[PDB]
């Protein structure tokens, strides 16, 4: 069956100890060692209204903001967009 073999040997240098791990199938090898690429740094979003670094994210508009006035302006703009496009 699909097994992982742990092996420890005695080999000459006068002798040293070495350990080996043997995977029966490549699926297990990929699962234990996905070789994941390094993650990406998220983009520091900025409030379109006040240009300050963003701290919030209005769920309705998905527009990040950093001020209550910015939130009110965003909601007013969304209402105007709804009225226009309908």
């Amino acid at each position: 069956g699909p097994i992982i073999t742990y092996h420890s040997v005695t080999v000459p240098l006068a002798r040293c100890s070495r350990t080996f791990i043997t995977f029966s199938d490549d699926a297990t090898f990929e699962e234990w060692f996905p070789q994941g690429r390094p993650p990406k740094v998220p983009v520091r979003e900025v409030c379109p209204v006040t240009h300050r670094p963003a701290l919030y994210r209005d769920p309705v508009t998905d527009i990040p903001y950093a001020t209550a006035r910015a939130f009110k302006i965003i909601r007013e703009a969304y209402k105007k967009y709804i009225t226009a496009h309908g």
């Binding site: 073999t5 742990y6 092996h7 070495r18 350990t19 080996f20 791990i21 043997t22 995977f23 029966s24 199938d25 490549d26 090898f29 234990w32 060692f33 070789q35 994941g36 690429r37 390094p38 993650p39 740094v41 998220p42 979003e45 670094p53 963003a54 701290l55 919030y56 994210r57 990040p64």
Partner: protein, 445 residues
């Protein structure tokens, strides 16, 4: 520390390099013979080759016995353990008196442990197995190392580790971009969160995102930890941190001192000896100060004989201001210092004498300097005259009320009138006793 206590001016024993006591040094005035004897005792403590030796400070009250003991403690330093204790503390509702005495004895014997802690910090940048071109058994892939890349503020290093660490890595759920640390002495990986550079302002995790480690990837330092035998004994008698039902009961139940057995103490002694032989630890025998020894009863003194006869005991300092008093716990048995003659045969007696008026004036001046009080020469002489009668403690206790009265009056120094007014306002023990005797009918009992 910022508040000024009664022995805040004692910075040690004012001894010359030859052991002779200077007339006034390190906050101590007079008591030259007692200071020289205390210096000999300090050398004995530093020699670390004697156990169970006892010294009794005997003298009238207010003669510097506690001050001398604290000077000894200052001379030894913070490295040497110093466990103060009053005789009234042996009467406990939880453990027997002999257990209290034994616990304080073990508190006085310290142990200093020196170890090197080597760790590898960093953010995991690379996780690549080192396969072998000849798979063992013919099928599959075999790996001989796992390359882990660790990134810190001022460097990046790669560590070729044992393949067996793959299981620890999977158990800790370590992935790329996570901050981990590996301990050399154990070969284990612990995930101390994820790097903060991958966290956004819209995340809500609290203990998940951690800053990128500063400094080098390979950090090693020498850790010096000071412990006492009583610490190990108590930590082993009522252990904290287990997940069994007994640890849960210990957490639930009200904590209570218990009679630690000789088996546990012998095991602790064996472990300490093993550590010393390995070179990890160095024994630091300190001092147990038992003030008001006369408050101990006959049972405590009898146990103290065996306690002092032990080869593990610290150096014990006693103090008693009693004369030919009756030992507590006995019916009409009188001993020269409130201590049975059997225990007095086991101690070295240091005599503290009364202070001459000049020494009293010097002590008053030193106490005024310590308390930040400026006192005029005439006021100082008047206060020394007050101290010739009454006691020295009364004079050193009139300094701060007089300073307050001067400050209220608008003066930066104590004059004679302030001392006179304070003396009028406050009575001493003798004046109060005279008042009580003159009106014994009007008082109660």
């Amino acid at each position: 520390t910022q508040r000024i206590a009664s022995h805040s001016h004692v910075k040690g024993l004012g001894l010359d390099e030859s052991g002779l006591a200077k007339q006034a040094a390190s906050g101590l005035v007079g008591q030259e013979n007692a200071r020289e004897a205390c210096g000999v005792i300090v050398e004995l403590i530093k020699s670390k080759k004697m156990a169970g030796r006892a010294v009794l400070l005997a003298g009238p009250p207010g003669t510097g016995k506690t001050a001398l003991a604290l000077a000894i403690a200052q001379e030894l330093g913070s490295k040497v353990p110093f466990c103060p204790m009053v005789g009234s503390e042996v009467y406990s509702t939880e453990i027997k008196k002999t257990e209290v005495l034994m616990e304080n004895f073990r508190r006085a014997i310290g142990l200093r442990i020196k170890e090197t802690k080597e760790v590898y910090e960093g953010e995991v940048t690379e996780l690549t197995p080192c396969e072998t071109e000849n798979p063992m058994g013919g099928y599959g892939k075999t790996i001989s190392h796992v390359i882990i890349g660790l990134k810190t503020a001022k460097g990046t290093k790669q560590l070729k580790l044992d393949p067996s660490i793959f299981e620890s890595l999977q158990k800790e759920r370590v992935e790329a971009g996570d901050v981990i640390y590996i301990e050399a002495n154990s070969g284990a990986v612990k995930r101390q969160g994820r790097c903060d550079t991958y966290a956004t302002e819209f995340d809500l995790e609290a203990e998940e995102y951690v800053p990128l480690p500063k400094g080098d990837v390979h950090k090693k330092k020498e850790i010096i930890q000071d412990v006492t035998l009583h610490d190990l004994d108590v930590a082993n008698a009522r252990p904290q941190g287990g997940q069994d039902i007994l640890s849960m009961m210990g957490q639930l139940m009200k904590p209570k001192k218990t009679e630690i057995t000789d088996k546990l103490r012998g095991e602790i002694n064996k472990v300490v000896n093993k550590y010393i032989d390995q070179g990890i630890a160095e024994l630091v025998p300190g001092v147990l100060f038992v003030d008001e020894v006369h408050m101990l009863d006959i049972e405590c003194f009898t146990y103290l004989h065996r306690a002092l006869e032990s080869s593990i005991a610290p150096i014990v300092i006693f103090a008693s201001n009693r004369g030919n008093c009756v030992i507590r716990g006995t019916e009409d048995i009188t001993s020269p210092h409130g201590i049975p003659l059997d225990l007095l045969d086991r101690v070295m007696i240091i005599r503290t004498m009364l202070y001459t008026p000049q020494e009293m004036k010097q002590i008053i001046k030193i106490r005024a300097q310590t308390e930040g009080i400026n006192i005029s020469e005439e006021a100082l002489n008047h206060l020394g005259e007050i101290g010739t009668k009454t006691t020295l403690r009364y004079s050193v206790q009139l300094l701060t009320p007089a300073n307050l009265l001067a400050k209220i009056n608008g003066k930066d120094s104590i004059e004679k009138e302030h001392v006179e007014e304070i003396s009028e306002l406050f009575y001493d023990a003798k004046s109060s006793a005279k008042i009580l005797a003159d009106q014994q009918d009007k008082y109660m009992k």
